[PDB]
């Protein structure tokens, strides 16, 4: 079976930079017959299908912007993109068809943008969850950049780990920044048991962390 | 215009089997080769197996992940490619995609969802995060739903039915304990809440249940 290996990773870059990735196969893609490289890149953005931007290693698919251009011959193949725009933002694979197909690992592409501090807010369990007997606390971190963030949480001035759970946006398409949630899940009688619970959100836009609160005996 | 259409996935237990189905129209079907490509939450992208054209006589490839387990199969009456999915493990839950190919011009389906578990079809606790009732204004307020113990993926959100899009930052389910619990938030004008209403629309197609959740003030 043929390997596919793509380069880097990730990175990211400001809009109007130019990107290059690599990928190898593990061995020749070039049909003796047809002269051809089979070797195609693909364009997959976040919620859909992936969509052909190169076959052929160099050939364009009908409709695609001359800024993608891809490169290369036998095992190593090169995609570059001329003036990054932000709805580039995307995983982009390889895909061997010399000899069945194999897709490589992905190289993501996220966008440079100024920094951004979160803007955050906290929400005490509603009415409704403590009826069932749970007890979850949320605190929301919105459009902030960059990625890199750090949340802690509190009760009564204690630092809790256990029950906590935290999601991630993919980079927003409109302004590039990120946003995160974070739940702390509780029992209905612990929950009960406490007053005072803070989130705390660290970020490289400040050296002083970002706190929400609630106190439930006010 | 090509059409592909993906249909037949959903839950089922560890061991079980599944037939997938590829709809498509706009096209000759008998022309072309035809893939089975998958991808699971947040994963690369792993090629299946194809089914060859008429000129080659219908006949089938599988990568050695799948081959003795998985069967592609196609009707060229009805223009339709089938994937018959036996002795299914966890491993094996993801997006399925069936994807046209030939030996370029590029048409996946939409994909169908596979979720190979033990645990069952449970409709989400959609709870309303409200502000605390001794919380402090400004010019935006931030509101959201929790959306809670769900499963199998996935859930929609939508705010006052999209108008409120603009705001809006729904993150990615995660699993906890062996159900999903996701989040979403909104940001209005302090002025438009609560002297209109916003509520959270969520759907859970798995289920057949669909709740809106209006977010009064407490």
């Known amino acids: 079976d043929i390997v596919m290996s793509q380069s880097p990773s990730s990175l990211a870059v400001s809009a109007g930079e130019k990107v290059t990735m690599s990928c190898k196969s593990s061995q020749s893609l070039l049909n003796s017959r047809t002269r051809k490289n089979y070797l195609a890149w693909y364009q997959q953005k976040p919620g859909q299908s992936p969509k052909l931007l190169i076959y052929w290693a160099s050939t364009r698919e009908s409709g695609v912007p001359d800024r993608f251009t891809g490169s290369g011959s036998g095992t190593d193949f090169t995609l570059t993109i001329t003036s990054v725009q932000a709805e580039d933002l995307a995983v982009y694979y390889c895909k061997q068809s010399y000899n069945l197909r194999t897709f490589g690992g992905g190289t993501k592409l996220e966008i440079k943008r100024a920094d951004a501090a979160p803007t955050v807010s906290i929400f005490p369990p509603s009415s409704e969850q403590l009826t069932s007997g749970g007890a979850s606390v949320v605190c929301f971190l919105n459009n902030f950049y960059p990625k890199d963030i750090n949340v802690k949480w509190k009760i009564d001035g204690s630092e809790r780990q256990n029950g906590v759970l935290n999601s991630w946006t993919d980079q927003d398409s409109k302004d590039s920044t990120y946003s995160m949630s974070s739940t702390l899940t509780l029992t209905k009688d612990e929950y009960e048991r406490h007053n005072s619970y803070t989130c705390e959100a660290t970020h490289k836009t400040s050296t002083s962390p970002i706190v929400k609160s609630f106190n439930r005996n006010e | 215009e090509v059409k592909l259409v993906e249909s037949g996935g959903g839950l089922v237990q560890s061991g079980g089997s599944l037939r997938l189905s590829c709809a498509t129209s706009?096209?000759?079907?008998?022309?072309?080769?035809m893939s089975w490509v998958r991808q699971p939450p947040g994963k690369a992208l792993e090629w299946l197996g194809f089914?060859?054209?008429?000129?080659?006589?219908?006949?089938?490839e599988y990568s050695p992940s799948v081959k003795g387990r998985f069967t592609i199969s196609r009707d060229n009456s009805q223009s339709i490619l089938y994937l018959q999915m036996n002795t299914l493990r966890a491993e094996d839950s993801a997006t399925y995609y069936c994807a046209r190919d030939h030996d370029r011009f590029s048409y996946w389906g939409q994909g169908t969802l596979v979720t190979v578990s033990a645990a069952k079809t449970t409709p989400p606790s959609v709870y309303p995060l409200a502000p605390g009732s001794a919380a402090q204004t400004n010019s935006m307020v931030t509101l959201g739903c929790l959306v809670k113990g769900y499963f199998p993926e996935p859930v929609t959100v939508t705010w006052n039915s999209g108008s409120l899009s603009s705001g809006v930052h729904t993150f990615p389910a995660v699993l906890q304990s062996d159900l999903y619990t996701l989040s979403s938030s909104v940001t209005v004008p302090s002025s438009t809440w609560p002297s209109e209403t916003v509520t959270c629309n969520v759907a859970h197609p798995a289920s057949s249940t669909k709740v809106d959740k209006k977010i009064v003030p407490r």
């Open positions: 089914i060859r054209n008429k000129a080659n006589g219908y006949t089938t």
């Open positions: 706009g096209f000759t079907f008998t022309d072309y080769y």
